[PDB]
Amino acid sequence: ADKELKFLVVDDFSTMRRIVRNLLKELGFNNVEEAEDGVDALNKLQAGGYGFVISCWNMPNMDGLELLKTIRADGAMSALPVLMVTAEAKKENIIAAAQAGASGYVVKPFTAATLEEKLNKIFEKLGM
Incomplete structure (x- = not known):
């Protein structure tokens, strides 16, 4: 996948958004908005x-x-x-x-490993 893929993290809890953003960052996805x-x-x-x-x-x-x-x-x-x-x-x-x-x-x-797994499966599924 493209590590520069622009993500949009949606949640009314800013803490939850922060978590998700940090997990993506951990996987090397830095392009994130909320x-x-x-x-x-x-x-x-x-x-x-x-x-x-x-x-x-x-x-x-x-x-x-x-x-x-x-x-x-x-x-x-x-x-x-x-x-x-x-x-x-x-x-x-x-x-x-x-x-x-x-x-x-x-x-x-x-965890980042669980997220990774979900993302990779979708990337693949979408031939991304």
Whole structure:
């Protein structure tokens, strides 16, 4: 993969965003920006040049699922990789995400090695 891939880390918890950003940094992905909700994420993706989205499932105003659905329906970003992050694995959330086209899903807290594994599988899957 391209270590310069521009990531957008979405979560209403700044601590959670910080974690994710540091784990990416640990894997050598330094190009990272943050969004506090689905709306903010879309405003940012509309600026352009993003290559990957890592989004929390639960956020006020526009949750991860709605954001994901919006991205997938967007002509220009319809295939942007979207990894969903959740603190609780629920069979239904997983299925719902898959179906809406989530690139992957991970339960937090996770380590850089777990993240790496998820990212590599999506990169490959997307022949990235």
